[PDB]
């Protein structure tokens, strides 16, 4: 993830911020509340008026956390554990808002470090902030509990030799429903019932069968598959939630009595995990 060169660029830039960390934090928050108002729903109790006293306070606490992160850059997850339980478990903040804050943090830094905001430093800072987010967004809906393990098997098993058949139907439902995904298969004949989609559809379900078989160690199992997507192709992460929704609709259209709320929830948790495995190497 972060390279030694990256660590160095961070430490230096944050070093230059210095005693202003406190005020830059209140500014990033204000900019955010102003550019992305939907974020305000997480602070219904605060006084978000300009120059507010409550905002000056939280900004400093947010700043102290980045200093903690910058100071323990080698073990981010450790030093930020409590901060993670809070945003994930207590607060329940959707991961998409971390991208909005980080953004307003970089904008603040850029406007205050004229000489320092080089493209190289801009790049190293954007990765750090993305790491901090991943860490505070880690322990959300996670872990395949033993009950899910059963569900995924008690359901995938009930697919059988109709796996390649369903994986092809998942792909078509995605291409039709979400047209932008075709930007990854431009040379294919994405037409209904094509041999490309069918020949490809069986591979997806074969890798999914394998993921179920190795449900407790997908990270090893899918290693070369994650390299393909995250590195050789660079598929945008959000696309994976599209392929996942479509597999659920297909699965649910073919195995109804078996698609109970309990079964549903577990397949959603499994597919969410598969996606993350193929995601990882992206940054």
């Amino acid at each position: 993830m972060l390279s030694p060169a990256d660590k160095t660029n961070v430490k230096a830039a944050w070093g230059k911020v210095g005693a202003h960390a406190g005020e830059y934090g209140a500014e990033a928050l204000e900019r955010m509340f102003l550019s992305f108002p939907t974020t305000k729903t997480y602070f219904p109790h605060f006084d978000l008026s300009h120059g507010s006293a409550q905002v000056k306070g939280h900004g400093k606490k947010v700043a102290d956390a980045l200093t903690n992160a910058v100071a323990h850059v080698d073990d981010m997850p450790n030093a930020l554990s409590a901060l993670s339980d809070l945003h994930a478990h207590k607060l329940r903040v959707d991961p998409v808002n971390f991208k909005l804050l980080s953004h307003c943090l970089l904008v603040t830094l850029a406007a205050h470090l004229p000489a320092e905001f080089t493209p190289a430093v801009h790049a190293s800072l954007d990765k750090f902030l993305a790491s901090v987010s991943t860490v505070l967004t880690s322990k959300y809906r996670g872990v395949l509990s033993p009950a899910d393990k059963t569900n995924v098997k008690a359901a995938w098993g009930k697919v059988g030799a109709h796996a390649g058949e369903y994986g092809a139907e998942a792909l078509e439902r995605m291409f039709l429903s979400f047209p932008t995904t075709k930007t990854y298969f431009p040379h294919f004949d994405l037409s209904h019932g094509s041999a490309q989609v069918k020949g490809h559809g069986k591979k997806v379900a074969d890798a999914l069968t394998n993921a179920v078989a190795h449900v407790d160690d997908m990270p090893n199992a899918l290693s070369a598959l994650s390299d393909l997507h995250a590195h050789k192709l660079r598929v945008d992460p959000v696309n994976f939630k599209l392929l996942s929704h479509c597999l659920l609709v297909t699965l649910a259209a073919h195995l109804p009595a078996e698609f109970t709320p309990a079964v549903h929830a577990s397949l959603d948790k499994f597919l969410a995990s598969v996606s993350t495995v193929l995601t990882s190497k992206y940054r």
Partner: protein, 146 residues
Amino acid sequence: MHLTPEEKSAVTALWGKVNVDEVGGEALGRLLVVYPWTQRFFESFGDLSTPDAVMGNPKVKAHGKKVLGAFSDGLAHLDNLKGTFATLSELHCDKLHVDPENFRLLGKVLVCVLAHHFGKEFTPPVQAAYQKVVAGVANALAHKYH
């Protein structure tokens, strides 16, 4: 929004078989059972521990129908959901404080219900016309935010 006469006839066609009531609670209960955190908004109901607690809880059902109703209403004014969901959009922002990014979870849960209760009938081209409809409704609900 932009619906082709064909998909503006396919959507309404299949909805004419939708039991808004039972489907209203099938969708809402799953939201509560599939994306647990959303439960912090509905304690007003009661016991939401087990999926059996959820689907059986009568508050969830009762509310689920009030929701699939506004949805049906949005379907009568398919090309102006901003005006039909304006009030509700003010309610969810000011009173309820819901990050609009949740509106999308109900969208994918409802579609799955349509797939479950129609299987074969809920063909790929139908799904598509539906994806468009829920997205249009989500953007209407998130419209009055500020």
